[PDB]
Design a protein around this ligand. Sequence first.
Ligand SMILES: CN[C@@H]1[C@@H](O)[C@@H](O[C@@H]2[C@@H](O)[C@H](O[C@H]3O[C@H]([C@@H](C)O)[C@@H](O)[C@H](O)[C@H]3N)[C@@H](N)C[C@H]2N)OC[C@]1(C)O
Lengths: 58, 132, 143, 178
Amino acid sequence: VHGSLARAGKVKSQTPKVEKQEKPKKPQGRAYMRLLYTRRFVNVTLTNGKRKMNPSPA
Amino acid sequence: DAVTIRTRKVISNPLLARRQFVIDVLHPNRANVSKDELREKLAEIYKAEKDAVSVFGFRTQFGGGKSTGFGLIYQSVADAKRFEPAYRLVRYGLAEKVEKASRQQRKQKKNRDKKIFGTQRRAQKRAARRNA
Amino acid sequence: GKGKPRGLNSARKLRVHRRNNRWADQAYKARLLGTAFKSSPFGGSSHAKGIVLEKIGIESKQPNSAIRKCVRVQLIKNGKKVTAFVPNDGCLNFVDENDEVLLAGFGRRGKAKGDIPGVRFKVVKVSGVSLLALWKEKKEKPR
Amino acid sequence: PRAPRTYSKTYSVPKRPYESARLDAELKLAGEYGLKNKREIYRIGFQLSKIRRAARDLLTRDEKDPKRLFEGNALIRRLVRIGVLSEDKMKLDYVLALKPEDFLERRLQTQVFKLGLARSIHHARVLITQRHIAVGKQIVNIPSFTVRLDSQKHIDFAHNSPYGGGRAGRVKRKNQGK
RNA sequence: AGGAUAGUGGCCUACCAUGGUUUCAACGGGUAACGGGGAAUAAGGGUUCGAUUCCGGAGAGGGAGCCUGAGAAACGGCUACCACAUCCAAGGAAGGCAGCAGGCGCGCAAAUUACCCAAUCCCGACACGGGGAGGUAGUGACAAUAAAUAACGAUACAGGUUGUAAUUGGAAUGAGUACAAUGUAAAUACCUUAACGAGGAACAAUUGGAGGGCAAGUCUGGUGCCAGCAG
Ligand SMILES: CN[C@@H]1[C@@H](O)[C@@H](O[C@@H]2[C@@H](O)[C@H](O[C@H]3O[C@H]([C@@H](C)O)[C@@H](O)[C@H](O)[C@H]3N)[C@@H](N)C[C@H]2N)OC[C@]1(C)O
């Protein structure tokens, strides 16, 4: 079980192609700071002392 | 609309037989007036002629309105012509922008006269006779 | 005590002793021997251009098992032959024999990086365009 | 040729990029003063830091010392004038207690927010940027414009403002007519 | 002791003496070496850099030799050789961009053959002439300063006096295009300003990351020690 120069680009080539999703733009600048400041100190979602900022949907 | 002229730092300048001061316009609801307009108002205020008044360098404060500048009140058209440069006079009309060629053209001509000794007529007629 | 001279008039001994012993410091010795200027493939620069001589696949070191996609390159400035490495899955196919690539080090200051045996440089551009753009198709290879 | 122009930098990034405590505190400051980014926090840190280096050195000196008295009193007065320090704190030892929460109060964004000119501090920033504010008889468009005590009294809508007397603006002049 | 120099001096000559430097590193070799004021980092002590805005030196392809002149061993002066190189009717003639701009080459690596003496100062017989010195524009994400990409209200909602998840409206604005003045040697640009200039305000922010160091997922497909990532 070896490789060689022939198999170059294999996985990126055979990756099923999925386009990016149209979605609302996010604010750029001090409004983005507004958004972060609320989500972290105004609409805080504290879970018994475990604050997760990218919790998986489960 | 309610244009005002305000002066500070006045120097009486007899050596150039003129007078140096700083000029402020207090104009609201307006961009700014032309320099010539300040010349007519300066004339009416100080009962001097238009051609004895010269102003330059006008800049406005942040937020519009007030502008500063610098002006000269001479005591004749003769004086304002003796102590003044050509560009201000071309601005007003007290002179004319002389119709010289470009700087490259003038320099190239002057270098082209460096290849002839003596009068141009002599070389011209000489070359004409030798080109017969 | 302490094995160094302490006398008020011992400055020459201390200065010369320090001068002798800095030669054991690899950075200082490289700088004062001029090794980067006289023996480095790039001659001491940050980047260098070259011509591709071939393609080569190098077996990675243990405990990994892969084939790293590398090119044999001869530099324009001095004709030295160096092995460079092309990042980003699907970019050995962007380089061909007798193409002009722009190279740079791996960030380890003349040492090998990772599991790749005996390779010191990474390809940055090919035929005047960067591999990052060709990988992301922001630009296409001019031929 | 002509002599060089002197210039300098006004901030310094932290040595440790990812400190949870420091990052959280900086986000809190940005939210409490409606700042654009951390460099504005960085600038306060930098300028207060050089103030405290000089002022610490002064406090390490002796009283009645001309270097000490002269420079310390100059610093104290330049601090009291802007509203960083108050009336009863001309001692040179209260300056060390100063905080980035102090220097950030004096900004025109915060001041416009605090005296009813805006519905939110974000509104205050967009009013200053969109040129609706005036400090005394000088119109100011810089949010970080520091207001002393003298210009504390003299903040109002622009003399020619849509909110201060004058033609309203494009959306009005395009909608009210119909 | 003389000669030469503007003048001292082995600067050179004649005669004479045998001296002069060195482990406190002479002499020789290297320098990807013009020196300094300075620069970067900096608890302190240090380390590293300084071709380059000012001062000092040196050079004008390489070498040498001179004229003129108070002053040059001058190169936008001459003379000669070497190397390059232009024209030629083949007899001859003419050169020196490490000035400004521009080309070729070199390379990882650097901009227009633009306008002007209005400021700065310089030169001349000169108040007036000349100045690519210099100043103004073009290219200019080298660095540095300030600083937009949004905001405010209402419905039922949601929630323990507001901090609330969406879509309903009134407004505000400069990015930009452009009457006009200003700015300027003339301009341009800034600053000031008629008529214009936003709901997906599509006038749509990027670069890197999400195992640890180190801030941020054990979500879904693909592959299957391959392809790739990884300081
Ligand atoms: C070839 N590598 C050499 C290594 O041999 C050694 O060099 C020493 C050198 O340091 C000594 O010499 C040293 O010390 C003496 C001291 C006695 O005063 C100094 O006078 C001298 O200047 C200094 N270089 C010299 N005497 C012998 C070399 N082999 O260390 C320096 C080095 C460059 O790494």
